[PDB]
């Protein structure tokens, strides 16, 4: 739960997308207006904020905000 709060803040602070528009099924690229460069800064932001590393292989594996949360929490 807490992780969505932080994850959402990241998304909002980066892609700058309204807020309350951050749904677990919300696709970063399709539903939030993220190009390839935005998604790489996003992943990097996540790497710091949670002290984890996300490979290019893994970055592809996570399309939605929920995918982000799930990846983070396990």
């Amino acid at each position: 739960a807490d992780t969505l709060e932080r994850v959402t803040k990241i998304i909002v602070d980066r892609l700058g997308v309204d807020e309350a528009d951050v749904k677990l099924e919300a696709s970063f690229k399709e539903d939030l207006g993220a190009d390839x460069l935005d998604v790489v800064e996003l992943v990097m932001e996540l790497e710091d904020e949670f002290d984890m590393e996300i490979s290019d292989e893994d970055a592809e594996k996570i399309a939605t905000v929920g995918d982000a949360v799930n990846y983070i929490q396990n």
Binding site: X36, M44, E47, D56
Partner: protein
């Protein structure tokens, strides 16, 4: 896969890294590309970085898989020959020829890539 790729990347977006450009550089560049980057001045670092991101985004487009499981930024390297002509060596590309061209404006880095039958 056989295809073509085009990518234009705004310089400001790469320059606006400040304290994130090192991590970004490391994610984007191979070992030898990173060595060249550390040798550059700050304005030159952003240009170099945007050109490589464009060349690699374009390449992944032509490769038809995008960046991920089948292709990492680290599997693609842009090198320059004696005449300063850029070419790409990729660890995942099999029996095919690759062509690349990079150009710069004050605000942009643009690259095009062609992956052809040998």
């Amino acid at each position: 896969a056989y295809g073509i790729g085009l990518d234009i990347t705004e310089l400001k977006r790469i320059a606006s890294m400040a304290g994130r450009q090192k991590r970004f550089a490391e994610r984007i560049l191979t070992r030898s590309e990173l060595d060249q980057y550390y040798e550059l001045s700050e304005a030159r670092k952003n240009e170099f970085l945007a050109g490589r991101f464009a060349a690699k985004e374009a390449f992944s487009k032509a490769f038809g898989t995008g960046i991920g499981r089948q292709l990492s930024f680290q599997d693609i390297e842009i090198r320059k020959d004696q005449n300063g002509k850029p070419y790409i060596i990729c660890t995942k590309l099999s029996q095919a020829a690759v062509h690349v061209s990079i150009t710069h404006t004050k605000e942009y880095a643009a690259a095009q890539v062609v992956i052809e039958r040998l």
